[PDB]
Write a protein that binds this ligand. Structure first.
Ligand code: 1SQ
Length: 377
């Protein structure tokens, strides 16, 4: 699996991408790694933001499915033409598979100007595929057509350019320290999980745990932030704001409507608390917790023409679609998407940014009663 180590790159805020090839002869494209969706879709026309795009006319192995897809998100969108073709991952397993590919022919607020990726690899399940669950996701095709075991793991690092590893078919123990702890995939649509308890600084939010998961909690490599549901984010920041009363900041800041700047080499690490999510464990009444530091929820914004300090975006925010464990969480951990056993493993990442003080942790077991009641139906 050392072949796969360091096969991810990116820039802060613009996600993590892997090199893939499509068609015969092979066309090289950089493809965003997304556990939050389930379509394999690639730029297929000369949109000016794109370094390159899929040229179906050049591929002897292309096949038209003669059907379109339309994919609207919150304020962005793409649209494309469905087909199949031969797909490899140069720094991945030594196999080639025939996968569905959406040739993106129109889009809005999807591709990023200045970015170095040209498509998206949806690694979640068929249930949330588009147009419907009959379009076989890529990882499904990979597992059917080859002997690649039904799992992948992600070590997301990064600082500027970011980096990481996507180990397809397995686990690389150099990527983590201590033990893996597993939480069940509650249902195979998103990578859905259940948070059973939340502590800020060790003190807990004493919230009905059902709220922590209103209406979903998912693990998503295509989202930067830890996103928390209205009511939970509400209480969430209430406690973080109180934990950090030493210094003052605007409301808009906590709303991600403003940035906050401290002078260089002089940010208050310690005036923010370590935050801990308890996840449902593998055994009745047993949980574990994963703990992140503010270096995860306080993310720099590279630079500005209108300033030159250490200016950070508060990486926690609200949602009407649920908790989203994005890069803020995943960069603290080696994350194992154990599809064969319907579970997600968390271990302390060998590349997480730590001090000589506080440190990301994955600890258990804890005793948590009524953890099913925490799931929203
Ligand atoms: N994961 C993911 N994939 C595509 C679009 C998104 C928009 C907002 C959050 C996550 C997304």
């Amino acid at each position: 699996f050392v072949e796969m180590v360091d096969n991810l790159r990116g820039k802060s805020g613009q996600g993590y991408y892997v090199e893939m090839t499509v068609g015969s002869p092979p066309q090289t494209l950089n493809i965003l790694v997304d556990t939050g969706s389930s379509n394999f879709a690639v730029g297929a026309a000369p949109h000016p933001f794109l370094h390159r795009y899929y040229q179906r006319q050049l591929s002897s192995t292309y096949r038209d499915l003669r059907k379109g897809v339309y994919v609207p998100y919150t304020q962005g969108k793409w649209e494309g033409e469905l087909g199949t073709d031969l797909v490899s991952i140069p720094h991945g397993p030594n196999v080639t598979v025939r996968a569905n590919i959406a040739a993106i022919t129109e889009s809005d607020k999807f591709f990023i100007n200045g970015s170095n990726w040209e498509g998206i690899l949806g690694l979640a399940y068929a249930e949330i595929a588009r147009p419907d669950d009959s379009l076989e996701p890529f990882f499904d095709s990979l597992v059917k057509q080859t002997h690649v075991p039904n799992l992948f793991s992600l070590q997301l690092c990064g600082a500027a350019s970011v980096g990481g590893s996507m180990i397809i078919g397995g686990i690389d123990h150099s990527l983590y320290t201590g033990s893996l702890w597993y939480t069940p995939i509650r249902r195979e649509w998103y990578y859905e999980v259940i948070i059973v308890r939340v502590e800020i600084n060790g003190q807990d939010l004493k919230m009905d745990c059902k709220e922590y998961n209103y209406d979903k909690s998912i693990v998503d490599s295509g989202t930067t932030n830890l996103r928390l549901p209205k009511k939970v984010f509400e209480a969430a920041v209430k406690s973080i704001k109180a934990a950090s009363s030493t210094e003052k900041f605007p409301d808009g800041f906590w709303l991600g409507e403003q940035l906050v700047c401290w002078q260089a080499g002089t940010t208050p690490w310690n005036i923010f608390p370590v935050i801990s999510l308890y996840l449902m464990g593998e055994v009745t009444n047993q949980s574990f917790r994963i703990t992140i530091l503010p270096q995860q929820y306080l993310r720099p914004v590279e630079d500005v023409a209108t300033s030159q300090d250490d200016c950070y975006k508060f990486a926690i925010s609200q949602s009407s679609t649920g908790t989203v464990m994005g890069a803020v969480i995943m960069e603290g951990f080696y994350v194992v998407f154990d599809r064969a056993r319907k579970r997600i493993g968390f271990a302390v990442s060998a590349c997480h940014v730590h001090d000589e003080f506080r440190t990301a942790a994955v600890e258990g077991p804890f005793v948590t009663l009524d953890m099913e009641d925490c799931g929203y139906n």
